[PDB]
């Protein structure tokens, strides 16, 4: 089996990217974020106090011949951003662009913190990192790609996000006329549950390429790019005023700018993400202050290839008995 998603950007800069999904019996379609970076499929639902729900699309398991209490279960989940969520667990019928995996652990939220209230967009989340990071508890439960692993032609979920623009989620196979020249392969670890790798380096603009190792995680959801303070300063240096503002939680820029590009190495090969990519407008309505795609991880803890750098590349997931991640230019 395959399944093929379009996957559209929430507002104009790409905070994130949301899909269509089936869930249940009649189907009762959510546009969650399908997000590389964890491991919990949840949603929005009947159950979610009401204080907490703006404009959501909700899940109502009572409405759905095919759910299933998961009877004792429970999850809870923290987010590199801060946000939460939590609640029980239903198992039903989930479908993602044709393809259909029976008795997925759909995890109903009863609480959700301020800032999924906020975004009316996202309806919940589908998470593609390794099951390990599942939270559902006292039973860990697999994610959609686990669950629809075996029966998938080849054992592949691919990412093609687009710059202001829709792109695709496809699974289990790679569609060949979706990028240019061939694409590069490269390690994973799974020490982490994340889809964890090692970048070649970097350069800036029309600058030479640095070599050196970058560990980080394919996070699509992520929305920039965090890297080494001091991979982040060379690039900040090369745009005139720009600065790290403690105020504001980061690199801005002025807005007159003209960005310079950021490239990355996966392997020999080099993905290039064009200086318009990493513009996330003004930091408040009418400012002529900027906000950095490009931003520290000095404090994350880990390095995250997030979708500043994603949607550069057609992204290939291989979960393989050895996991590895292709890259692509498109």
């Given at each position: 089996?395959?399944?093929?998603?379009?996957?559209?950007?929430?507002?104009?800069?790409?905070?994130?990217?949301?899909?269509?999904?089936q869930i249940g019996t009649p189907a009762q379609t959510l546009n969650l974020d399908f997000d590389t970076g964890s491991?919990?499929?949840?949603?929005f639902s009947s159950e979610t106090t009401a204080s907490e729900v703006d404009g959501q699309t909700i899940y109502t398991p009572s409405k759905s011949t095919t759910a299933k209490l998961l009877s004792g279960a429970t999850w809870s989940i923290s987010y590199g951003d801060g946000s939460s969520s939590s609640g029980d667990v239903y198992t039903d019928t989930v479908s993602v662009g044709g393809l259909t995996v029976t008795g997925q652990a759909v995890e109903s939220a009863k609480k959700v913190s301020s800032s999924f209230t906020e975004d009316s967009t996202i309806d919940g989340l589908l998470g593609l990192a390794f099951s390990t990071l599942n939270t559902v508890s006292p039973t860990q439960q697999k994610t959609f790609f686990d669950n629809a692993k075996a029966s998938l032609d080849s054992?592949?979920?691919?990412?093609?996000?687009?710059?202001?623009?829709?792109?695709?989620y496809n699974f289990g196979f790679i569609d060949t006329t979706a990028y240019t020249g061939s694409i590069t392969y490269t390690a994973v670890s799974t020490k982490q549950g994340f889809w964890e790798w090692t970048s070649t380096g970097y350069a800036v603009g029309s600058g030479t390429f640095k070599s050196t190792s970058i560990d980080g995680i394919a996070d699509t959801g992520t929305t920039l790019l965090y890297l080494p303070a001091t991979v982040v300063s060379a690039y900040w240096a090369q745009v005139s005023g720009a600065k790290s503002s403690s105020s504001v939680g980061g690199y801005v820029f002025p807005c007159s700018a003209t960005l310079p590009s950021f490239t990355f190495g996966v392997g020999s090969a080099r993905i290039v993400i064009p200086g318009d990519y990493i513009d996330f407008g003004p930091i408040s309505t009418g400012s002529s202050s900027c906000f950095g795609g490009i931003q520290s991880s000095a404090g994350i803890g880990i390095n995250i290839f997030g979708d500043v750098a994603l949607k550069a590349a057609f992204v290939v997931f291989n979960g393989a008995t050895t996991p590895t991640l292709g890259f692509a230019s498109k």
């Open positions: 089996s395959t399944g093929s998603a379009t996957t559209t950007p929430i507002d104009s800069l790409d905070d994130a990217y949301i899909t269509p999904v491991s919990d499929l949840w949603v054992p592949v979920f691919t990412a093609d996000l687009g710059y202001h623009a829709p792109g695709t």
